[PDB]
Design a protein around this ligand. Structure first.
Ligand code: CLA
Ligand code: CLA
Ligand code: CLA
Ligand code: CLA
Ligand code: CLA
Ligand code: CLA
Ligand code: CLA
Ligand SMILES: CCCCCCCCCCCCCCCCCC(=O)OC[C@H](CO[C@@H]1O[C@H](CO)[C@H](O)[C@H](O)[C@H]1O)OC(=O)CCCCCCCCCCCCCCCCC
Ligand SMILES: CC(/C=C/C=C(C)/C=C/[C@@]12O[C@]1(C)C[C@@H](O)CC2(C)C)=C\C=C\C=C(C)\C=C\C=C(C)\C=C\[C@@]12O[C@]1(C)C[C@@H](O)CC2(C)C
Ligand SMILES: CCCCCCCCCCCCO[C@H]1O[C@H](CO)[C@@H](O[C@H]2O[C@H](CO)[C@@H](O)[C@H](O)[C@H]2O)[C@H](O)[C@H]1O
Ligand SMILES: CCCCCCCCCCCCO[C@H]1O[C@H](CO)[C@@H](O[C@H]2O[C@H](CO)[C@@H](O)[C@H](O)[C@H]2O)[C@H](O)[C@H]1O
Lengths: 312, 226, 213, 41, 221, 85
């Protein structure tokens, strides 16, 4: 198998001994300062991994676990916005009147008079009127409760510590070899198929089974505490057949190639949804389905371990 | 030692046939400590000999009278003619102190095998104690020891081990159906398909508490279900 | 060779078996310095020393309650005794800092200088405050039975019996607060509820302990 | 963990601890003393 | 090699020892060169054995309340399906146990920290578990060099598989009824997500209508 | 549905792609296509112990099964879209 898992067991001791010695990565910096240009060259040459060593394997292991550090910080950053979306927001009040209540998810502390930044954003709430549009993601995700935002914030802290573990594991404990990284045929087959392809298959499945029946009930007009919870939209097919009457046919029109019978909730409407101003969600559902079938097909392009497939 | 509990089983190294009833058993390693094997031997003899009194109590108390039920034979309303509605606090006061003497003398025969043989009041006749757990002397009024002692020492355990399982049977054939052992023998031998192990496991005939003179008792069956 | 907190895993290098209650439990390597570990051995004792006083104090005032006596519960004993006896509350706490902040800095300069506090600097008492080892002063006042001398083989056993009761006293005084914040009643009311029905009257059936009720 | 306490005693870590000390001290004072424009008594 | 889908590349190391071996390795996960982490050749054979004999307890565990209920040996109140037991309280939960399924879950938590972590520290430290005092019961727990097959005087009670040649059969036959049973648990789960019935009911309904009641006529057309 | 208009298409498209690559009318694991169009031997990147005489592995079955579904689904929905069934 030319395409194979190849790591090295324990390349670097997990130790605080090198945190005691700043500038340890470079020859020019490890001898301590004599000049304030040392501490600027410390931060300048810090992530210049090509300049630390000459070994391309050691460079590659450094950029592979640093990417888990950037992803681990993004998972903290996302989980902040769901948490500040949960405990300090008006997302409960915003869904009932999303025309007058301004979206707000940052609340400041009343100390030096800076509580005047808590404006009258509506919905029985005071806070900084945000503009990053998370509340429009969350209605598109069909969140409808601050419990869902809190559970995916805890799911964000868990995922961030998993990403910090992964960069620690794939550098200090079990770090890959060089020819693992140089399988760019296997990387593109996995990233086009698994990341982009199965990702948009999975999100379409979130849009079929969760966001479409929730946002159909919001557009028809139902208070968000009266909508069925989305796990009830899975276990009960008879609820889904009330909104879109083709779930009663099950997944038989898919395998019988009677795909025109799915026309209720995979549409090609185009334009905008006039009730809410956004795109049609059944339009975006047929989008991410057809995106997924495209990338899973394109994810079987390059040759890895069997003679089929192209070689770059 | 031979003819073990299963055919193809190698006997453990600490079970070379010295003790009686040694069958190469212990698939839980408990006799691997030599100092623990003696105490587990003493506690096996205690669990054997109390069960042999327990079996010979239960299937005799219903031959002399199949009226008083042995599960509720401890309630003072069911005690016999000079003891009906006795104060159980007074009777427990006898039993505690009469047994904290006997057991601690036996316990010190474990801890110091040899410095507990004499009658401490009357410095007279000793008890010739050949091995631990087997006092003799005045505990042999019939002289049935001092023969092939190893033969009877195996007979004491094999009758004893069966009596342990039969007495836990005597309990579980009483909590499942509320019926005595020879009475559940009659219930089987009348209809041996509606009064089997089936359709009686999973029902506990014992209440949550039976009040004894102002005291409740938890009264738990050995499996859940009612 | 010795029993460790987690079987299989070896004890850390800084933690050979000489302390009382030593079971190799330092996963965070917090005692990796041999001089901060001299401080935490002092710290585990006086936390366990107060918790053994504490856990006996919660239990003995809760044994008296629910029998029929006029006792408060331990979370309400603070209010009821600065109200029954007309004790002004700041002048009670300040004297607590005077008497104990006296008794604490003596310890805090036992750790800095173990030979000290034994120069007759106090009222004449010299070798009473000498201090035998870390966390174990001894002498005439702190060991009036004289159990830390004579046989020292049984004293090492008493050292371990102090730490063992001292560990689970700290767990008890972490559990009395936890039984109160969850349920909202006294400790032996929670025990007697667990002895009424052991099923369904445990921690799992509050809705405060597991949120998946 | 002696090497870990050296890291806690570097220049930016003491800077970000002492600035949380000094801001956090002035924040608590400006909570319990609302708006001190002039030194009162 | 055997079991087509094999390859010449997954046949160098994968020789014919390491029982359950049939050469089927299209991806080449087990590979003693350049390995590390949990793709170690020792951890994967060990986890296959563990995944095998948990599944076959479940494979005889999901089917047993339904088979013994059709045979009338258990009452109809315990004739529930395996997903309707409290494992998935969305799918339905039996309310008549001796405790709340969160009481029984914590009893499961305690009993499976003491079972699984003793099970793990013999993988890491093979001579352990018969070293510290564990009620005298540590004399069982010496195990052997191999972690999947301890063979103490409890885990090899009847001393079955005496010789080496008789042992390779039973080690094979365990995996052979394991890889069947791991597929059976997949054929219990995915077959119950789609159908919504029990496994034995799906066995009865396929013996009744083989054609009109299978995977094909179950997509609810 | 068995033997309908679509079920005949999907059988006659999948088995056509299976009969293509087995009988030298499509590339396999054993043989690729050059920069032109000629069908030339491969490295196989692992070596296969296919017991079949043509070297036709299960990877060859999955590929031309995916292409047989890949052609056939485009034929079925292409014929529904034009109107011919
Ligand atoms: C996206 C943010 C990010 C990420 C992932 C990294 C990642 C890394 N930095 Mg880095 N760094 C950053 C921002 C970031 N940096 C910024 C803004 C600066 C200031 C310019 C620096 C300055 C800097 C220096 C000066 C050094 C690093 C070093 C490192 C490496 C050590 C990893 C480590 O100890 O983590 C473990 C840390 C934790 C907190 C664990 C998480 C829980 C790692 C590749 C060191 C390095 O590469 O040496 C070879 C090093 O000496 N960084
Ligand atoms: C189908 C399998 C698969 C999937 C899903 C991914 C996914 C990813 N790879 Mg990747 N990779 C793969 C196979 C795969 N890879 C193979 C086979 C190779 C070797 C040729 C590589 C080599 C490789 C390198 C060298 C790098 C990546 C990077 C990335 C990340 C892109 C960052 C991003 O856009 O955020 C997308 C983020 C998400 C989708 C969040 C979900 C994250 C999931 C849980 C982890 C990915 C799944 C994981 C691969 C499966 C193994 C699970 C693990 C427990 C063993 C993303 C997490 C880059 C990166 O960020 O480094 C960390 C990067 O530098 N990959
Ligand atoms: C990865 C995404 C994903 C996931 C996890 C699911 C999962 C599920 N779908 Mg679903 N579905 C998906 C994508 C997905 N689908 C897509 C892309 C479509 C459009 C072709 C459908 C169309 C669809 C229908 C029409 C039905 C399901 C149904 C189901 C449920 C049972 C499936 C079954 O019977 O077997 C299951 C929860 C059935 C039920 O759902 C509640 C059902 O009636 N699905
Ligand atoms: C049928 C079971 C049984 C058997 C075979 C034995 C056998 C033995 N016991 Mg034992 N014993 C038993 C039940 C039994 N006991 C019970 C139930 C108790 C509790 C009261 C005792 C209490 C006991 C003590 C305290 C002592 C013995 C002693 C002895 C030994 C000699 C006496 C003798 O032969 O008595 C056998 C008698 C019978 C078989 C009669 C059974 C008929 C019924 C009524 C011999 C090993 C003595 C010994 O070993 O001295 C060194 C000794 O000290 N046993
Ligand atoms: C090891 C398998 C097993 C397990 C876990 C249970 C578990 C249970 N059985 Mg059960 N049972 C079994 C095998 C099993 N049974 C067999 C083989 C027979 C014959 C019975 C006959 C049986 C009866 C007759 C009753 C139970 C009842 C019960 C319940 C309370 C006791 C509990 C859910 C009781 C219940 O509540 O239903 C009850 O009345 N069982
Ligand atoms: C950018 C993402 C990325 C990439 C490219 C890799 C790449 C690698 N990892 Mg790594 N890893 C990652 C993220 C990543 N990892 C994360 C986030 C973690 C933390 C959990 C780990 C933890 C980890 C460990 C502990 C080990 C590896 C190992 C490996 C190597 C082989 C992986 C393999 O064959 O498993 C194939 C993947 C599986 C068998 C699936 C595992 C089960 C996952 C969790 C479920 C599927 C997740 C899916 C992507 C998304 C959820 C689907 C669900 C909703 C149904 C390879 C070098 C192993 C190795 O060789 O050591 C270096 C190893 O021992 N990784
Ligand atoms: C031989 C039988 C057969 C028949 C009768 C049909 C008939 C049909 N197919 Mg079809 N198809 C077939 C086989 C068949 N197909 C096969 C074998 C496949 C698999 C490859 C497909 C895949 C396929 C897809 C994916 C789609 C159709 C569509 C259609 C319908 C309209 C086509 C049209 O107007 O596009 C005319 C469109 C254009 C002229 C513009 C195309 C430009 C695209 C959108 C963007 C630019 C791409 C790229 C940059 C261009 C240069 C790249 C080039 C080098 C490849 C029509 C009913 C379409 C459909 O169903 O619509 C309702 C559709 O989306 N077919
Ligand atoms: C008046 C209120 C203010 C007085 C404060 C107290 C002063 C007392 C004081 O000076 O102590 C008087 C002395 C002061 O201490 C003496 O000071 C001298 C001058 O500095 C020397 O240092 C002597 O060594 C030192 O003993 O204290 C004693 O020695 C106390 C000894 C107690 C002996 C008890 C024997 C114990 C055995 C019995 C147990 C059984
Ligand atoms: C003592 C005893 C009972 C004594 C009963 C008495 C006095 C009863 C008296 C009464 O009834 C009457 C007369 C009349 C009633 O009105 C009043 C009472 C008072 C109710 C039973 C013990 C009974 C004891 C029993 C059944 C013990 C069984 C233990 C087993 C089988 C364990 C085996 C293993 O542990 C080992 C040995 C080794 C490991 O390697 C392997 C395994 C398997 C783990
Ligand atoms: C990760 C693996 C990929 C596959 C995705 C699987 C995700 C797990 C989803 C499990 C949720 C349960 O899903 C499934 O439950 C029920 C059992 O068939 C179905 O419910 C249906 O079946 C029941 C019995 O047949 C009946 O009440 C109805 O027919 C209908 O309610 C749901 O239509 C389906 O949603
Ligand atoms: C490893 C294998 C995983 C599964 C592989 C994918 C499954 C097989 C692909 C689908 C094959 C054809 O699929 C299809 O044929 C069956 C015909 O008998 C249909 O069965 C049904 O079709 C109609 C309902 O829609 C009814 O009018 C028919 O009476 C009924 O036979 C199924 O609705 C469908 O499954």
């Amino acid at each position: 198998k030319k395409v194979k898992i190849a790591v090295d067991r324990n390349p670097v001791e997990t130790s605080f001994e090198k945190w005691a010695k700043p500038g340890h990565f470079s020859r020019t910096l490890s001898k301590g300062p004599n000049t304030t240009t040392w501490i600027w060259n410390l931060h300048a040459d810090a992530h210049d991994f090509d300049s630390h060593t000459s070994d391309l394997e050691e460079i590659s292991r450094k950029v592979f676990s640093a990417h888990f550090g950037q992803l681990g910080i993004i998972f903290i950053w996302l989980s902040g916005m769901y948490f500040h979306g949960a405990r300090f927001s008006n997302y409960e009040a915003w869904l009932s009147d999303p025309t007058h209540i301004k979206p707000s998810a940052q609340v400041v502390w009343p100390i030096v008079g800076q509580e005047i930044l808590n404006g009258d954003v509506g919905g029985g709430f005071q806070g900084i009127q945000i503009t990053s549009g998370f509340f429009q993601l969350w209605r598109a995700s069909g969140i409808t409760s601050e419990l869902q935002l809190y559970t995916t914030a805890i799911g964000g802290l868990v995922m961030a510590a998993a990403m910090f573990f992964a960069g620690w594991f794939h550098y200090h404990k079990a770090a890959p070899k060089l020819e693992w990284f140089q399988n760019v045929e296997s990387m593109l087959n996995h990233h086009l198929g698994g990341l982009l392809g199965l990702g948009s298959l999975a999100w379409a499945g979130h849009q079929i089974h969760v966001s479409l029946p929730v946002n159909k009930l919001l557009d028809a007009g139902v208070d968000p505490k009266e909508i069925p919870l989305p796990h009830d939209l899975l276990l009960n097919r008879a609820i889904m057949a009330d909104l879109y009457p083709s779930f009663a046919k099950g997944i038989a029109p898919f395998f019988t190639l009677n795909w025109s019978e799915y026309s209720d909730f995979l549409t090609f409407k185009g334009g905008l949804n006039p009730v809410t101003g956004g795109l049609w969600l059944s339009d975006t559902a047929h989008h991410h389905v057809a995106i997924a079938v495209l990338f899973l097909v394109a994810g079987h392009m390059y040759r890895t371990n069997w003679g089929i497939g192209h070689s770059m | 030692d031979r003819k073990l509990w299963a055919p193809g089983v190698v006997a453990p190294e600490y079970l070379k046939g010295d003790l009686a009833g040694d069958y190469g058993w212990d698939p839980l390693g408990l006799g691997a400590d030599p100092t623990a094997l003696k105490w587990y031997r003493q506690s096996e003899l205690q669990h054997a000999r109390w069960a042999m009194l327990g079996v010979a109590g239960v299937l005799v108390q219903e031959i002399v009278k199949p009226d008083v039920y042995f599960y509720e034979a401890g309630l003072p309303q069911n005690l016999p003619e000079p003891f009906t509605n006795i104060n159980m606090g007074g009777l427990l006061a006898w039993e505690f102190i009469l047994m904290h003497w006997v057991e601690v003398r036996r316990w010190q025969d474990y801890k110091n095998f040899g410095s507990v043989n004499e009658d401490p009041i009357f410095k007279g006749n000793k008890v010739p104690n050949p091995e631990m757990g087997y006092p003799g002397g005045i505990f042999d009024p019939f002289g049935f020891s001092k023969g092939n002692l190893k033969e009877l020492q195996t007979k004491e355990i094999k009758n004893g081990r069966l009596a342990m399982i039969a007495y836990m049977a005597f309990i579980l054939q009483a909590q499942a159906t509320g019926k005595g052992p020879l009475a559940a023998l009659s219930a089987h031998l009348s209809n041996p398909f509606g009064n089997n192990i089936l359709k009686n496991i999973g029902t506990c005939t014992v209440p949550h508490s039976v009040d004894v003179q102002g005291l409740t008792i938890p009264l738990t069956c050995l499996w859940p279900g009612s | 060779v010795r029993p460790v907190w987690f079987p299989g895993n070896p004890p850390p290098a800084h933690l050979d078996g000489s302390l009382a209650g030593d079971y190799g439990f330092d996963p965070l390597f917090l005692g990796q310095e041999p001089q901060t570990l001299k401080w935490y051995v002092q710290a585990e004792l006086v936390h366990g020393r107060f918790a053994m006083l504490g856990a006996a104090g919660i239990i003995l005032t809760s044994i008296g309650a629910k029998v029929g006596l006029g006792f408060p519960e331990w979370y309400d004993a603070g209010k009821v005794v600065v109200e029954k006896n007309n004790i002004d509350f700041p002048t009670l706490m300040v004297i607590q800092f005077y008497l104990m902040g006296w008794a604490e800095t003596k310890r805090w300069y036992d750790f800095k200088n173990p030979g000290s506090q034994a120069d007759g600097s106090f009222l004449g008492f010299t070798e009473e405050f000498k201090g035998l080892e870390n966390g174990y002063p001894g002498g005439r006042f702190f060991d009036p039975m004289g159990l830390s001398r004579g046989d020292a083989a049984k004293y090492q056993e008493y050292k371990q019996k102090e730490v063992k009761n001292g560990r689970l006293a700290m767990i008890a005084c972490l559990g009395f607060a936890a039984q109160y914040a969850a349920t909202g009643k006294g400790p032996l009311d929670n025990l007697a509820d667990h002895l009424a029905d052991p099923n369904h009257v445990n921690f799992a059936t509050n809705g405060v302990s597991i949120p998946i009720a | 963990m002696k090497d870990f306490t050296t890291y806690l005693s570097t220049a930016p870590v003491i800077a970000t601890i002492w600035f949380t000390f000094t801001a956090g001290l002035l924040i608590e004072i400006n909570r319990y003393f609302p708006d001190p424009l002039v030194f009162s008594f | 090699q055997l079991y087509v889908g094999a390859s010449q590349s997954s046949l160098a190391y994968l020789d014919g020892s390491l029982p359950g071996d049939f050469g089927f390795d299209p991806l080449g996960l087990l590979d003693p060169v350049n390995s590390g982490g949990f793709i170690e050749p020792k951890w994967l054979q060990y986890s296959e054995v563990i995944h095998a004999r948990w599944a076959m307890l479940g494979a005889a565990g999901c089917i047993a309340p339904e088979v013994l209920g059709a045979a009338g040996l258990i009452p109809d109140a315990t004739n529930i399906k395996w997903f309707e037991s409290g494992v998935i309280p969305p799918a339905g939960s039996y309310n008549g146990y001796w405790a709340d399924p969160y009481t029984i879950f914590f009893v499961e938590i305690v009993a499976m920290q003491f079972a699984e972590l003793r099970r793990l520290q013999d993988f890491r430290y093979p001579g352990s578990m018969g070293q510290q005092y564990f009620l005298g019961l540590e004399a069982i727990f010496k195990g052997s060099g191999d972690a999947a097959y301890p063979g103490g005087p409890f885990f090899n009670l009847f001393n079955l598989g005496k010789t080496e040649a008789a042992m390779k059969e039973l080690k094979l036959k365990e995996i052979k009824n394991g890889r069947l049973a791991m597929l059976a648990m997949l054929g219990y789960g995915a077959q119950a997500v789609m159908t919504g019935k029990g496994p034995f009911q799906n066995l009865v309904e396929h013996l009744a209508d083989p054609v009109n009641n299978n995977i094909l006529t179950n997509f609810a057309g | 549905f068995i033997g309908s208009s679509t079920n005949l298409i999907m059988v006659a498209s999948t088995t056509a792609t299976l009969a293509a690559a087995r009988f030298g009318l499509a590339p396999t694991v054993k043989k690729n296509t050059t920069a032109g169009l000629k069908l030339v031997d491969s490295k196989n990147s692992a070596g296969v112990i296919s017991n079949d005489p043509a070297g036709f592995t299960i990877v060859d079955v999955l590929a031309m099964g995916a292409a047989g579904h890949g052609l056939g689904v485009g034929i079925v929905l292409g014929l529904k879209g034009i109107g011919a069934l």
